[PDB]
Design a protein around this nucleic acid. Structure first.
Lengths: 117, 167, 183, 88, 52
RNA sequence: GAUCCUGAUGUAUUCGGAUGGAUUUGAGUAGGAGCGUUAAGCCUUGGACCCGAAAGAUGGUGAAC
RNA sequence: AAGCUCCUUCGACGAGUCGAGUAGUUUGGGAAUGCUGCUCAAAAUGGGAGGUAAAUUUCUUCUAAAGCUAAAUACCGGCCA
RNA sequence: UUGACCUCGGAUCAGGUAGGAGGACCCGCUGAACUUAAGCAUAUCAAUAAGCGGAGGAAAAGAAACCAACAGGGAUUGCCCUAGUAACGGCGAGUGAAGCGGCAACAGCUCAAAUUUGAAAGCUGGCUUCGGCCCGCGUUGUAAUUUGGAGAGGAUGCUUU
């Protein structure tokens, strides 16, 4: 499979450790900007779509509005205190709702919220 | 290449760029994290020494030892074990250890002032004129078209009177 | 108010009122210049839904484009040709959008809403001053208007696999031999 | 497959993105009378006034491209005929 | 530049080699056969107290 | 696994295959051998051991028959 | 000025655009894979795309024809190291 | 007779803006042939080279008329595997994806379709003693409110600047 001019389109990766250093320094810069805050936002537990991966779960995009309302977190405050919100996802069942609500109250139990001024 | 050959033979100076990065790599200021941040330690070790969580996501590689930073039912209701239609909107009602953690709790728990919002002179004059004609009948004050041009409800006027201290 | 009625009228283009008005206007436009300044939009509902505002800094420009093939068909749309010709006449303006206003046997007429990026009424408005940034210089020449977005196949789905992020970038990504350090 | 307790979902506001609104129906009816008819709609209406419904449906299908669009157009023009006779 | 510059070695073989090198370092004739001047060294795995 | 008949108890009454037989097959089972790496050899494709046409195409420079 | 709650009140969503026929071009891709030119030309409990032999197109999932937006990505050129 | 409106022009009037360069990377338009198939025309080369137009420090794309058939996922981009699989093909040469899964990075929004109608509340210019004064744009619609996993209006009681 070398029918085309592959010489002009070879990508080497001699900058792999340098890019790893760059990524770690970017994370350090994020830490410097957000000093007591975590560098990541909280994300829900979701089930993998297909039948092949139905058994396992992973991290989602953001919490459903029903999950936030059931956990006692208002919708507008949630992105400002480190929680990700996804308006597209639906719960569709009482078992993902309970799991992500438990995740949200676990996050609330370990949060140090500071006053505005 | 021709430009670089030109500058090599030119007497014009080589303009050396300082290594000014767009983003600072260390926190700064007079806050708690800045005075306890070790510049020779990584993010994970610093957040371990603080007693805080650095990454809320799933672990993506192996960590060093001691990381500590890379984290009846009558109606069948799954949520009734989760309990402890309007909620407070602008804040939460949340109810040995490292020193930075204790300092953060202390500075987050310290009492603050409120800066209670007062009332304008014209609003106080309006509420005063409203009291001088009816006294306490808030229903009559709401009915009054002359002294209450914006036809406000008696509950709103009672709340404004209570805030003014005019009962 | 009235724009709902005008939208419903614009949806019946062979009815008697709209056919009569289209023919009279086509006659006038045919006898005008190819690219001529229009004082106001002939279709205010259509211009308003495309972002035209009756504010200093907004300009309409009517343009006629010869219709037909280039059996080699021109892969460029006639509406894209209209915006490009107007964008060269008004090289100080930014092409915001354009829309069909009329068609004849030999021409198709389009109106192009342009925006002046140097007017202070545009530079102070946070809803339009994104066009003041120099990355929006000649959007019609890089396929960045509505016709450009349609002709480049910039849609989501399995039907747009090779074009949704750029056809040539996708081709360069698929034709690149990636050799890592540890092989 | 797996057993889970299905929830009743909140009503989607994106449901029925057409029009159940009476004002848009009013505007559509008023514009129809003001604007008039297309030439092909006038041919379909002159076939429908003569009772030649089969020819009207074939003509509409030929000039619209789908049997469903032809059916919808023929029902709309028959409704226009009905209100025109009622006003007459 | 797309010559193979780096070599992938199994981590098990690298740990085997590191353990073999550690075991060889505890043998003093291997220390002098490598070229180290240890004729005044009291014990070949030269352990000093951490307090120093 | 599957194929050739004999065609059980049974069957929702139109479904099923129990017993006895076949010159059966298979990259089938019958107590796993693979994964990774190094060195050497061979094969295919890239300029492909080195040098060596007439051509063809794209874009330009000039004239003057 | 702002968020939330409640409801004997309301809730407007982009048209020579979808689509049909046809000629090129392109794609692994005739639900034409996408695009374009010509002819005709829509809808409103609508429209698009999928699932399904399962008894009829049951069900599922989104809203096109207006627009903006950092990061992770590329880099034989520019200022350097 | 006079004054509006609309439309089309002039001015060495005032304030601005575009052209060229560069073009490694990027976004479009246009577009070959040699070669392989031991000949060659479909095919390949290659949606490449050359040519033309347009930007930036990145560009482009981008917040589903998406993927999916799930116990569901949830803007875009890129890496890994998917996978030389599906699919297409003088079924020869060959051409050749994508969903899921692991990761890097993550951020959401602005309009049009509403009557502010108890008050165009909006904006470009000129003059300035710089504080507020004029002409104009605009009702064929400039502010505020709203953008359909929404929203508005009333009522209601807390909580925010």
């Amino acid at each position: 499979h070398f029918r085309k001019h592959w010489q002009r389109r070879v990508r080497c990766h001699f900058d792999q450790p340098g890019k790893k250093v760059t990524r770690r320094l970017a994370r350090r810069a994020k830490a410097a900007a957000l000093a007591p805050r975590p560098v990541d936002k909280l994300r829900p537990i979701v089930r993998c779509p297909t039948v092949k991966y139905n058994r396992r779960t992973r991290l989602g995009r953001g919490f459903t509005l029903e999950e936030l309302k059931a956990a006692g977190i208002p919708r507008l405050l949630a992105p400002t205190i480190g929680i990700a919100v996804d308006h597209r996802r639906k719960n569709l069942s009482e078992e993902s709702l309970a799991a992500n609500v438990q995740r949200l109250k676990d996050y609330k139990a370990r949060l140090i919220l500071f006053p505005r001024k | 290449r021709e430009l670089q050959k030109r500058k090599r033979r030119s007497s014009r100076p080589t303009i050396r760029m300082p290594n000014r990065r767009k983003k600072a790599l260390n926190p700064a200021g007079n806050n708690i994290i800045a005075k306890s941040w070790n510049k020779k330690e990584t993010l994970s070790q610093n957040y371990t020494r603080f007693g805080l969580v650095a990454k809320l996501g799933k672990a993506t590689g192996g960590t060093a030892p001691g990381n500590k930073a890379l984290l009846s039912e009558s109606d069948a209701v799954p949520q009734q074990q989760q309990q402890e239609n309007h909620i407070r909107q602008h804040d939460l009602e949340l109810e040995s250890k490292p020193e930075v953690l204790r300092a953060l709790e202390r500075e987050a728990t310290r009492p603050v002032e409120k800066t209670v919002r007062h009332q304008s002179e014209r609003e106080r004059e309006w509420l005063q004129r409203l009291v001088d004609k009816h006294g306490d009948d808030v229903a009559a004050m709401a009915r009054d078209r002359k002294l209450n041009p914006y036809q406000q409800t008696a509950s709103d006027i009672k709340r404004r009177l209570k805030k003014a201290g005019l009962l | 108010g009235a724009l709902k009625y005008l939208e419903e009228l614009s949806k019946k283009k062979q009815s008697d009122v709209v056919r009569f008005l289209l023919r009279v206007r086509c006659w006038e436009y045919r006898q005008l210049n190819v690219i001529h300044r229009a004082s106001r939009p002939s279709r205010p509902d259509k211009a308003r839904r495309l972002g035209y505002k009756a504010k200093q800094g907004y300009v309409i420009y009517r343009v006629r484009v010869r219709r037909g093939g280039r059996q080699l068909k021109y892969q460029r749309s006639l509406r894209a040709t209209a915006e490009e010709r107007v964008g060269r006449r008004c090289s100080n303006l930014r092409v915001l959008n354009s829309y069909w206003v009329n068609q004849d046997s030999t021409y198709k007429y389009y109106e192009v809403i342009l925006v002046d990026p140097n007017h202070k009424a545009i530079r102070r408005d946070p809803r339009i001053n994104w066009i003041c940034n120099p990355v929006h210089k000649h959007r019609e020449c890089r396929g960045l208007t509505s016709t450009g977005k349609k002709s480049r196949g910039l849609n989501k789905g399995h039907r747009f696999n090779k074009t949704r992020a750029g056809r040539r970038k996708t081709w360069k990504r698929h034709n690149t031999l990636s050799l890592w350090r540890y092989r | 497959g797996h057993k889970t307790t299905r929830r009743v979902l909140k009503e989607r506001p994106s449901r029925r993105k057409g029009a159940q609104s009476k004002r848009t129906q009013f505007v559509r009816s008023l514009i129809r009378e003001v604007a008039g008819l297309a030439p092909y709609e006038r041919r379909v209406i002159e076939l429908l006034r003569n009772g030649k419904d089969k020819r009207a449906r074939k003509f509409s299908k030929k000039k619209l491209g789908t049997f469903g669009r032809a059916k919808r157009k023929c029902e709309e023009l028959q409704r226009i005929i009905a209100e025109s006779r009622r006003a007459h | 530049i797309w010559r193979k510059w780096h070599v992938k070695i199994n981590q098990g073989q690298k740990r085997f080699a590191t353990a073999s090198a550690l075991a060889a370092s505890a043998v003093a004739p291997l220390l002098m056969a490598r070229g180290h001047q240890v004729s005044t060294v009291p014990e070949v795995p030269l352990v000093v107290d951490s307090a120093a």
